[PDB]
Every structure is written in C-alpha cells, then in structure tokens.
C-alpha cells in the first residue's frame, strides 16, 4: 500500500543529512516525516556492521567481547558490540573481521551474517549487518591481542561471560555512568530468556 512520494533535503553535513519525506498513507492521504540519513552510504548493502564476537577457549566459559568508547552524540561512554561503517567495495564479512581486529585485537572466524537490519527505523534509514564471529582464544594470534584503533578512535575492550551477560552488564551500569547499547541489551535479555 504505502510508498515514498518525495525526499527533500533539509540540511546536509559531512556525515549526516536531514530530509523531509513525503509518503502515501494506506488510506490514500499524503503525509510527511523527518528522516535522518548518513551521507557515506554508496553501494553497500548497509551502512555498517556490528560484530557479535564469541570468544572460545578451552576450559573457559564463552565470552561475548564488547567495546566501551566515548560517543559524542550521547555525551558519554557506551558499551556496544564492536562496529564500524563498511568501506566502499568492502564485504560485510570483511568489514566485520577488520573492525573486530581494529577495535579489539582479536582475529575472528566468520560464523554467520545477517541481512541488512535497521538501526532506528522511525528516525533514520541506517542499517547494519550483524556478523557473528567466533574467536579461537587458544590460538597464539589471540593471546595478548592489542587494539589497532584508527586516528581519533579510542576503545576499551570488555569481555563478559555469555552465561551471565545481563547481570554483568547490570553490574557495570551500577558502578559507573555508562549506557549499554540496545542491541547488546536485547542479546543479553534473550540469553536469559532462552
């Protein structure tokens, strides 16, 4: 039934633009919406990737590897899956493995790759692939992994046991001013609910 009629640029930065979207409602009436988009999306099947990195080690419980960074939009520190935007011509899988190594030091193995999923669809068109990666933490490459962050990127790695992830997250939120990412929290809730 519904569809876009027009998209009008309101304002365009270096990284983000705001648009006035006109669309057709299912009753047949024209309506508008204010839409956010990134300026950096070319032919990628998505803007970015987030990596679900399952750290596996003999005689250890599996960990989920997370990153903590300052997020200017939020005015504070956030705990998130490792993530970045997909470079032009780069596959979601390569992006995921590359970002994971850059942000964490770990060299993963692809497990699965989602279709493009929407970040906040009442607001933006932004999409990612969620890439599940296993990390063989018994491999020498992953022994004392060092982040290789880019210029102006500053990241702390936090590995939490999968079998207690929601409580460990809650305990971190209790001890500091920090925000957990909604995807991380969703994943931790399902681990509990399962």
144-to-79, 135, 137, 147, 178 alpha-carbon distances in Å: 21, 13, 10, 10, 26
Interface residues for a second copy in 138-167 (CB under 8 A)? 152, 154, 162
Select the span of 65-73, 86-94, 96-104, 136-144 touching a second copy (CB under 8 A). 65-73
How far apart CA 151 and CA 139 sit, in angstroms, is 28
Choose from a second copy, Cl ion, ligand JJM, none: what does 164 bind? Cβ within 5-8 Å by kind.
Answer: none
Interface residues for a second copy in 93-112 (CB under 8 A)? none
CB 133 within 8 A of CB 109: yes
Interface residues for Mg ion in 83-142 (CB under 5 A)? 83-84, 102
Three state DSSP letters for 45-56:
CCCEEEEEEEEE
- Which residues, at least 6 apart from 123, have a Cβ–Cβ distance to it below 8 Å? 35, 36
Token digits of residue 35: 């839409």
34 sits near ligand JJM (criterion: CB under 6 A): yes
Among 29, 122, 140, 174, binds ligand JJM (CB under 6 A): 122
Cβ 25 to Cl ion shortest distance, Å: 35
28 sits near a second copy (criterion: CB under 8 A): no
38 is in an annotated binding site: yes
92-to-3, 85, 87, 161 alpha-carbon distances in Å: 28, 9, 9, 26
How far apart CA 20 and CA 9 sit, in angstroms, is 6
Cβ 138 to Mg ion shortest distance, Å: 26
Select the span of 43-51, 60-68, 90-98, 150-158 touching ligand JJM (CB under 6 A). 150-158
152 sits near ligand JJM (criterion: CB under 6 A): yes
CB 150 within 8 A of CB 159: no
Select the span of 57-65, 133-141, 146-154, 155-163 touching ligand JJM (CB under 6 A). 146-154
How far apart CA 158 and CA 67 sit, in angstroms, is 6
Binding-site entries:
15, 33-34, 38, 71, 83, 85, 99, 103, 120, 153
Q: Which residues bind ligand JJM (CB under 6 A)?
A: 15-16, 33-34, 122-123, 150-153
């Amino acid at each position: 039934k519904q569809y876009i009629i027009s998209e009008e640029l309101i304002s365009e930065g270096k990284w983000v633009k705001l648009e006035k979207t006109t669309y057709m409602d299912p009753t047949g009436k024209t309506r508008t919406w204010e839409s956010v988009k990134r300026t950096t999306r070319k032919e990628q099947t998505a803007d970015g990737v987030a990596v679900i990195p399952v750290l596996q080690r003999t005689l250890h419980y599996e960990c989920i590897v997370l990153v903590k960074q300052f997020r200017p939009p939020m005015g504070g520190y956030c705990i998130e899956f490792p993530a970045g935007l997909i470079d032009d011509g780069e596959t979601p899988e390569a992006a995921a493995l590359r970002e994971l190594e850059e942000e964490t030091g770990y060299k993963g193995d692809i497990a699965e790759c989602s279709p493009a999923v929407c970040m906040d669809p009442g607001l933006s068109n932004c999409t990612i692939h969620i890439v599940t990666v296993t990390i063989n933490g018994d491999d020498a490459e992953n022994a004392r992994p060092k982040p290789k962050p880019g210029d102006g990127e500053f990241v702390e790695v936090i590995s939490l046991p999968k079998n207690d992830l929601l409580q460990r997250l809650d305990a971190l939120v209790a001890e500091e001013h920090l925000t957990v990412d909604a995807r991380v929290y969703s994943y931790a809730l399902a681990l509990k609910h399962a």
